[PDB]
């Protein structure tokens with residue numbers, strides 16, 4: 001029931017009607033079940049990000065609990081910070097840190113990044129993923145859209161709307177959750193899975209950064225999933241010279257067998273991440289800067 005869901009959600013969100021201390025909502029994104037707005041904290045003038053989920057439009061409701069609960073009080077340099085969560089009418093509102101730099105999707109679909117830039121993104125995501133995996137947090141939506149940047153190029157992991165929590169007692173999830181093109185093969189095959197699905201999704205995002213799009217992106221999503229399930233681990237098709245470290249790096253991420261796929265803590269030591277540039281190397285790629 002809808003009101004049954006709204007009632008349970010009211011117990012886990014913060015109390016209050018946040019429309020009191022926020023105004024000047026500017027819509028900047030749409031996710032098919034919700035939107036995302038820039039808002040102004042009326043008491044300080046600072047800008048925050050506010051995402052509003054239409055409760056009536058959630059295929060499966062438990063996911064909204066995951067994000068608001070798992071992310072409350074979470075602090076990491078490479079993770080977008082959630083300030084508060086509120087139930088407003090038929091919408092869940094998440095008030096979070098606003099990243100003015102926007103998504104990595106805008107960079108990857110317009111220009112090809114150099115290895116120093118790709119290494120910098122990988123390092124930021126892997127640092128966030130290693131801390132999250134250690135606490136049992138599975139992101140389940142790693143892609144370019146889930147990467148947000150500051151104006152000076154700092155990488156922050158975003159969109160924990162599909163995240164989940166595993167423990168020593170229940171160490172695996174089984175929900176069919178994620179974006180079809182970045183989904184791990186064990187997940188598409190409807191097997192139980194753990195944090196290793198994020199490592200595969202990261203490997204697909206490397207292909208994004210090199211090739212501009214994930215494999216099979218021209219195909220409909222259900223077609224891409226059948227192909228991920230049955231085909232061999234993609235390697236870069238963007239056949240412009242790639243360094244051997246990047247080649248060896250991707251070979252540790254895009255492993256069909258999750259038990260053989262490298263973990264986040266293992267990849268933090270990989271030679272490819274030595275290529276990582278400073279956050280400033282991301283800056284020229286952003287739309288506000290790349291045409292000057």
Ligand SMILES: C[C@H]1CN(C(=O)c2cn(-c3ccnc(N)n3)c3cc(C#CC4(O)CCCCC4)ccc23)CCN1
Pocket residue numbers: 028029030031035036049051067071080081082094096097098099100102145146148157158159160161
């Ligand atoms: C096509 C797009 C549609 N999208 C958007 O429009 C989004 C834009 N932002 C922006 C943008 C700029 N700055 C910020 N701070 N957020 C989003 C943040 C989240 C999120 C989240 C959290 O889970 C992170 C951990 C704490 C709790 C909340 C989700 C979606 C968006 C998503 C990508 N695909």
